[PDB]
Design a protein around this motif. Structure first.
Motif, short mmCIF file in Angstrom:
data_model
loop_
_atom_site.label_atom_id
_atom_site.label_comp_id
_atom_site.label_asym_id
_atom_site.label_seq_id
_atom_site.Cartn_x
_atom_site.Cartn_y
_atom_site.Cartn_z
N UNK A 128 -9.89 -7.52 0.03
CA UNK A 128 -9.34 -7.18 1.30
C UNK A 128 -9.03 -8.44 2.07
N UNK C 35 -8.67 -2.47 1.62
CA UNK C 35 -7.51 -3.36 1.64
C UNK C 35 -6.34 -2.80 2.41
N UNK C 36 -6.18 -1.51 2.34
CA UNK C 36 -5.10 -0.84 3.05
C UNK C 36 -5.70 0.33 3.87
N UNK C 37 -6.34 0.00 4.99
CA UNK C 37 -7.00 0.99 5.82
C UNK C 37 -6.14 2.14 6.27
N UNK C 38 -4.82 2.04 6.30
CA UNK C 38 -4.08 3.20 6.72
C UNK C 38 -4.31 4.30 5.72
N UNK C 41 -6.37 7.65 6.61
CA UNK C 41 -5.96 8.83 7.30
C UNK C 41 -5.83 10.07 6.43
N UNK C 42 -5.65 9.92 5.13
CA UNK C 42 -5.51 11.05 4.26
C UNK C 42 -6.83 11.67 3.81
N UNK C 92 0.65 16.52 0.56
CA UNK C 92 1.80 15.94 1.24
C UNK C 92 1.61 14.48 1.62
N UNK C 94 2.33 10.57 1.69
CA UNK C 94 3.56 9.85 1.69
C UNK C 94 3.65 8.96 0.45
N UNK C 95 4.83 8.94 -0.18
CA UNK C 95 5.09 8.22 -1.41
C UNK C 95 4.71 6.79 -1.34
N UNK C 97 2.27 5.52 -0.50
CA UNK C 97 0.88 5.24 -0.77
C UNK C 97 0.55 5.07 -2.27
N UNK C 103 -1.66 -0.50 -7.32
CA UNK C 103 -2.04 -1.91 -7.23
C UNK C 103 -3.59 -2.06 -7.28
N UNK C 104 -4.31 -1.19 -6.61
CA UNK C 104 -5.74 -1.26 -6.68
C UNK C 104 -6.26 -0.86 -8.06
N UNK C 130 3.66 3.53 -12.29
CA UNK C 130 4.86 3.88 -11.53
C UNK C 130 5.56 5.12 -12.04
N UNK D 37 7.47 16.50 4.03
CA UNK D 37 6.05 16.23 3.94
C UNK D 37 5.50 15.91 5.27
N UNK D 40 3.03 18.39 7.31
CA UNK D 40 1.58 18.53 7.16
C UNK D 40 0.85 18.49 8.47
#
Ligand code: HEM
Ligand code: HEM
Ligand code: HEM
Ligand code: HEM
Lengths: 146, 141, 141, 146
Positions: A128, C35-38, C41-42, C92, C94-95, C97, C103-104, C130, D37, D40
């Protein structure tokens, strides 16, 4: 660079064990193999037909040592990435015409290679911190594009 | 995947574009160069000044290729095969750029097709340009 | 499009994952969360602390579907049709992601299988995550 | 958010001719149709199954006006986007769980909606300033995400 002290310190300590020469050559070579369209900036390096051809190629290894060499000097200037890389930014846009999306690709390859070399030690928190550095370095490298 | 409705939506909207394609291509490009300046690194041999003849000539080609894919909407991977080889083996434009030109083409059509650029149509045009982009990118590696 | 070398590369590297797949899936998520905290939300229903059991349990689930795609490599869309439905109409996600998890996963594989993560395998593994992502997002609209 | 004074003046010029209630409705609705999408987040809004059902859904029209009112307000503070949006950013992350990519999608839809409404007046230079502006707002809404 919203880097935290323990992040700053996670980055630095690890970097002190990196063989820049080996790592830079592996990073640049992988980029050319994994994302072959990046080879468009490297016609004169010669044969790049196959992965072997790319990893053995000396100009590739030498160009790799050079890129990370500069990345490396960047890790000393973390509180000011934009300033350090400003002229590097200009050269990249105006003489070389390298799109910045390339700088992110390479960062992501770089992180894979550090994981490959250090294993257990390249832990989730230490990753990170690197993702942050690599995204900053890419943003600074792109800052002067207009 | 494009649905029967999508194909109809695209055939109607593109039909209105008619013989303005070329001009809309160039406008799309100009919008692209101004909004996403990093894309100019792929046309360094190009003069990008407003109203440049190279910009125009390139728009006509872009729009011609789009027009060809509409004429072959059910066989796009074959219809676009050549463009797809060019972009993968010679031009090697990074994939993220395709999205950017697409957005600009949509802005351009929106700005010129007040009545036909409905929500349903927009959605169809958007899927369409994503299919085109996917085909042009399919041989990258 | 996966070439034969690619499939072979992927079968061989996935072969050495073997019984750690679950544990590698859990580590990939954890690398994704930090690494990618957004991406957090899922999973607002999850305990996302380190070692938490929902992360683990979900790690295995992802790992197993990956396994299922390796085994059904020539046949992905059918083998994953159900997961593909689930993501398009229920989760649903988002692509964008998909690229972050992929990558992880790769970093997780690079961290775990040193001699197997040659440059050719890296390339193949990336192409494979991919195509899997493509399949998982093909019915989104 | 490097906005030149000519850019700020063009962004502000145009915005005065905008009817926010109508443009807000159109943009939230078109985001929901073009990129389904994103539905949601709106299951309580009722029927969102066909373009006419979304576009004309009253809950969608009222949420759109609300979203855009806050955007507008944002245009009076182009110099302190982050501060202006801090509380919204927190709400979206930590109560609503809205992933930041959604803000960029909406910005892009907003650009076409402007394009749709103004024809020629939406010149390429004007587009470009609106893109920097939607991007800064997306970033400001995301800046409290952790
Ligand atoms: C980590 C990010 C990168 C850094 C720090 C970096 C740094 C450098 C430096 C210091 C030079 C020396 C130029 C001179 O002698 O004045 C250079 C040259 C160059 N870099 Fe970058 N680079 C980066 C990424 C990239 C990537 C991603 C590409 C494209 C894939 C690229 C393409 C080039 C090219 C084409 C040259 C000229 C090589 C030649 O002399 O033939 N760089 N780079
Ligand atoms: C909607 C998707 C696109 C289509 C349909 C398209 C189509 C075409 C066509 C027909 C040509 C002419 C090649 C020839 O003379 O045979 C071309 C060339 C070219 N395209 Fe693409 N293109 C697309 C997107 C892009 C994008 C996104 C870029 C990079 C930003 C790009 C970069 C180029 C370049 C540099 C050339 C060569 C320019 C020249 O030297 O004439 N294209 N494209
Ligand atoms: C290689 C790509 C991925 C694969 C193969 C995959 C596979 C799976 C599987 C097997 C499930 C469980 C379905 C079940 O309940 O039986 C699932 C659910 C889920 N995934 Fe995906 N996944 C992928 C990527 C993602 C990503 C990128 C996200 C977003 C960051 C995501 C978010 C979720 C969520 C929120 C669920 C429901 C989890 C729950 O509520 O328990 N997935 N996925
Ligand atoms: C232009 C960027 C946006 C702005 C300025 C904005 C602003 C707002 C405001 C002011 C509220 C009401 C807050 C409250 O209830 O206290 C709200 C609510 C909400 N927003 Fe955002 N919003 C934006 C984009 C989005 C996007 C793109 C989505 C999802 C795709 C989203 C999802 C939601 C949801 C679910 C609510 C709560 C609705 C309800 O009351 O049930 N927003 N937003």
């Amino acid at each position: 660079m919203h880097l935290t002290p323990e992040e700053k310190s996670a980055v630095t300590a690890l970097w002190g064990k990196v063989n820049v020469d080996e790592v830079g050559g592996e990073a640049l070579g992988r980029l050319l193999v994994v994302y072959p369209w990046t080879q468009r900036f490297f016609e004169s390096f010669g044969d790049l037909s196959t992965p072997d051809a790319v990893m053995g190629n000396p100009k590739v290894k030498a160009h790799g040592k050079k890129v990370l060499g500069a990345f490396s000097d960047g890790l000393a200037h973390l509180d000011n990435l934009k300033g350090t890389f400003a002229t590097l930014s200009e050269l990249h846009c105006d003489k070389l015409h390298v799109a910045p999306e390339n700088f992110r690709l390479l960062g992501n390859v770089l992180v894979c290679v550090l994981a490959h070399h250090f294993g257990k030690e390249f832990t989730p928190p230490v990753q990170a911190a690197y993702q942050k550095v690599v995204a900053g370095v890419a943003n600074a490298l792109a800052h002067k594009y207009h | 995947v494009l649905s029967p409705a999508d194909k109809t939506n695209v055939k109607a909207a593109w039909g209105k574009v008619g013989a303005h394609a070329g001009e809309y291509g160039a406008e799309a490009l100009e919008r692209m160069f101004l909004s996403f300046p990093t894309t100019k690194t792929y046309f360094p041999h190009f003069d990008l000044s407003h109203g440049s003849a190279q910009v125009k000539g390139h728009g006509k080609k872009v729009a011609d290729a789009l027009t060809n894919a509409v004429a072959h909407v059910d066989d796009m991977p074959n219809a676009l095969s050549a463009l797809s080889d060019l972009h993968a083996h010679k031009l090697r434009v990074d994939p993220v750029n395709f999205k950017l030109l697409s957005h600009c083409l949509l802005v351009t059509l929106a700005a010129h097709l007040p009545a036909e650029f409905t929500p349903a149509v927009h959605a169809s045009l958007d899927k369409f340009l994503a299919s085109v982009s996917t085909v042009l990118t399919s041989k990258y590696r």
